[PDB]
Amino acid sequence: GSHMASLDMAEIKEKICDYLFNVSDSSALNLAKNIGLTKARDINAVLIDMERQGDVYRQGTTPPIWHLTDKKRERMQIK
Ligand SMILES: [Cl-]
Ligand SMILES: [Cl-]
Ligand code: NI
């Protein structure tokens, strides 16, 4: 919920990266449905931390839809 340095949170973060990059942009609710419903609070915590760092952004309110940022995609893809 805070333990961003744990193996467990690194695994949730890569599952989020994998989904947002290879599947699509997503609500947090849909990420939990795909990654594991019992991990919703850690998914929310990782998204908030990635947002603070400019690696994802949220779009809209009901619910917000999470997207990879251009800064993050530039580390992953060619222009
Ligand atoms: Cl990542
Ligand atoms: Cl990836
Ligand atoms: Ni934590």
Side-chain angles (χ1 to χ4, degrees), residues 45-63:
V46 171
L47 290 166
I48 289 304
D49 191 70
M50 291 179 84
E51 185 180 45
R52 180 176 75 46
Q53 290 176 146
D55 287 341
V56 294
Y57 67 92
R58 79 178 93 173
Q59 176 69 316
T61 58
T62 312

Side-chain angles (χ1 to χ4, degrees), residues 8 39 47 64:
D8 320 65
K39 293 179 195 285
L47 290 166

Side-chain angles (χ1 to χ4, degrees), residues 10-59:
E11 164 167 72
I12 290 197
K13 180 177 191 180
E14 181 51 36
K15 289 179 182 171
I16 291 169
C17 174
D18 189 2
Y19 197 92
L20 295 180
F21 187 72
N22 293 308
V23 182
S24 72
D25 49 304
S26 182
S27 67
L29 192 70
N30 180 72
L31 282 167
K33 185 169 139 123
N34 280 95
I35 294 171
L37 291 169
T38 63
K39 293 179 195 285
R41 192 175 165 77
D42 284 333
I43 289 166
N44 297 340
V46 171
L47 290 166
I48 289 304
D49 191 70
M50 291 179 84
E51 185 180 45
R52 180 176 75 46
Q53 290 176 146
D55 287 341
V56 294
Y57 67 92
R58 79 178 93 173
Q59 176 69 316

